[PDB]
Specification:
152 residues, mainly alpha, Globin-like, binds protoporphyrin IX containing FE, nitrite reductase activity, Globin, transport, oxidoreductase
C-alpha cells in the first residue's frame, strides 16, 4: 500500500527509465545474471552467454530488457490496481518459466542498484523508499498467486 505522494515518486523515477528503456533494461539483466549466475540458467536463449562482454554485445538481451521493463512500467502505472496485468505474469512465471520468488527479489534489488549506478546523486532517499515499496507490492502480489498455485 502506497500513498499518493509515494506513487508520485515512483512515477517520477520511472521517467528516468523511460528515457532509455533499452539501456536500463540491459543493465538490470546484466546485474541479475552476473550477481546471481543461477538465474541465467532459466533462459535457454541466454545460457550461451559466458562473459559480461558477450552479454553487453547481445542485442537480443537488450530486446528482452525492453520487454521486461515495458511490462513492469505498465504495472507501476496502475498504482496498485494491477490484478489483470499481474495475473498472466504470475501464471507464466510459476508454470512455464518456473521462476522462484527469490529471483524476483534479486531483480528488485538489481533495479535499485542500476538506478543508483546510472543516476548517482539523483535517486534520493525518498525516491528509493517509494520504489522499494512498489517493487515489494509487485513481489507480494505475485507471491500470493504462487501460493494459490502451490509453486515453490
Ligand atoms: C520485473 C520482473 C519481471 C518482469 C516484469 C518480467 C516480464 C516478462 C515478460 C513480459 C515476459 C514475456 C511474456 C511471458 O513469458 O510472460 C518474460 C519472459 C520471461 N521471464 Fe520474466 N519478468 C520478470 C522477472 C524475471 C526473472 C527474475 C526471471 C528469471 C530469473 C525471468 C525469466 C523469464 C523467462 C525465462 C522468460 C522467457 C524468455 C524467453 O525464452 O523468451 N523473469 N518476463
Amino acid at each position: 500500500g502506497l500513498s499518493d505522494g509515494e506513487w508520485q515518486q515512483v512515477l517520477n523515477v520511472w521517467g528516468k527509465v523511460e528515457a532509455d528503456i533499452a539501456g536500463h533494461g540491459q543493465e538490470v539483466l546484466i546485474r541479475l545474471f552476473t550477481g546471481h549466475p543461477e538465474t541465467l540458467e532459466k533462459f535457454d536463449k541466454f545460457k550461451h552467454l559466458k562473459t559480461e562482454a558477450e552479454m553487453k554485445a547481445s542485442e537480443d538481451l537488450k530486446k528482452h530488457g525492453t520487454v521486461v521493463l515495458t511490462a513492469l512500467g505498465g504495472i507501476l502505472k496502475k498504482k496498485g490496481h494491477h490484478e489483470a496485468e499481474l495475473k498472466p505474469l504470475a501464471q507464466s512465471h510459476a508454470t512455464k518459466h518456473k521462476i522462484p520468488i527469490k529471483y524476483l527479489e534479486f531483480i528488485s534489488d538489481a533495479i535499485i542498484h542500476v538506478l543508483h549506478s546510472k543516476h548517482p546523486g539523483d535517486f534520493g532517499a525518498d525516491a528509493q523508499g517509494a520504489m522499494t515499496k512498489a517493487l515489494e507490492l509487485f513481489r507480494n502480489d505475485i507471491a500470493a498467486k504462487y501460493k494459490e498455485l502451490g509453486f515453490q
